[PDB]
Amino acid sequence: ERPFVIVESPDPGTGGCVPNTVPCRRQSNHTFSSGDVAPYTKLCCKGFCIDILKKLARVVKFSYDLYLVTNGKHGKRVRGVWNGMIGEVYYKRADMAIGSLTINEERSEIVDFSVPFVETGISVMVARSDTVSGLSDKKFQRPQDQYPPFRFGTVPNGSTERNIRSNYRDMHTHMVKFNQRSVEDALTSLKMGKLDAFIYDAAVLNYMAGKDEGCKLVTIGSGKVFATTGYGIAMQKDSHWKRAIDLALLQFLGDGETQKLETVWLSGIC
Amino acid sequence: ADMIVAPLTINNERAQYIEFSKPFKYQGLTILVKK
Numbered sequence A: 001e002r003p004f005v006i007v008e009s010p011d012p013g014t015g016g017c018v019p020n021t022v023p024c025r026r027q028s029n030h031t032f033s034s035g036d037v038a039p040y041t042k043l044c045c046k047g048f049c050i051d052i053l054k055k056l057a058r059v060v061k062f063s064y065d066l067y068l069v070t071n072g073k074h075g076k077r078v079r080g081v082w083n084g085m086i087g088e089v090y091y092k093r094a095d096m097a098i099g100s101l102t103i104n105e106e107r108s109e110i111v112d113f114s115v116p117f118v119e120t121g122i123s124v125m126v127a128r129s130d131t132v133s134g135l136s137d138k139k140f141q142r143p144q145d146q147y148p149p150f151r152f153g154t155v156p157n158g159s160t161e162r163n164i165r166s167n168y169r170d171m172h173t174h175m176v177k178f179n180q181r182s183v184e185d186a187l188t189s190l191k192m193g194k195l196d197a198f199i200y201d202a203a204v205l206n207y208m209a210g211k212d213e214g215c216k217l218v219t220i221g222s223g224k225v226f227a228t229t230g231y232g233i234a235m236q237k238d239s240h241w242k243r244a245i246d247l248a249l250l251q252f253l254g255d256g257e258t259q260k261l262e263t264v265w266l267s268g269i270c
Numbered sequence B: 001a002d003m004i005v006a007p008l009t010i011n012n013e014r015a016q017y018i019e020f021s022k023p024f025k026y027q028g029l030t031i032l033v034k035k
């Protein structure tokens, strides 16, 4: 997830990655029925969520080992079986799960979440220089215009797509000209003129609008927080860790040690 | 009492003796001046 956790290559000659960076060998075991072993190349992860993980390891005194997941992005059950991060947590293949994970009522019935440490929601970034008033304007609600402002990004099988498909069936019906890749492809498609409005999470869009030549502007930011939620850590149902790390996280937000991470890891020019 | 429906802040000093619920409205802190 581009500011939160970054995966790169190891040292040119050493292999022991940079200080203040956590080794993270991804599991690429796409087949084991007729496959011997997939070579787990030693990559090293760094970023914001990994920093929070380091602080938690120092405070609550545990040990860890990251491993990237290769079944879906975050999770959207395909008729009864989950996938991704929530899927791994539910089927007891992993004790915890950290990253860019949103809180809902769809999956909070299956796993156990922590007190949120990042504020997020839904936002609508527009092309350049407001033109729309959010999710209530007649353009988005009623797609029947001669000039049809079209194709909010809304990458498939995400969390915001669940909100759209649950509340307003009309928008989900019309919006089929989506993007098949992450915000990186959607923003350049918008910059080239494919689609003029991107509908996605809040923090990632705010960051991507912060780090840009010139800058592109979102709709009114203080009012561009629709269906507010937060990020969080997903753990197995009713484990004794929830009592501890929860409290730990709160301590951070009381002491401003999360505040400095905002300055270090999440800043822009514009 | 058995519950509190009020603008109660969430912080460390309470979470040890109380079990809260997910926030329903976020806010911060500001200062008041006459103008």
Ligand SMILES: COC(=O)c1ccc([C@H]2C(C(C)=O)=C(O)C(=O)N2CCc2c(C)[nH]c3ccccc23)cc1
Binding pocket: A054, A057, A058, A059, A061, A062, A063
């Ligand atoms: C197999 O062991 C490890 O790999 C490992 C685990 C934790 C840490 C670091 C941690 C960081 C930066 O990750 C420190 O800042 C820190 O405080 N750590 C642990 C401190 C610690 C205490 C006091 N007691 C322990 C009991 C069990 C595990 C750890 C501890 C270091 C290495």
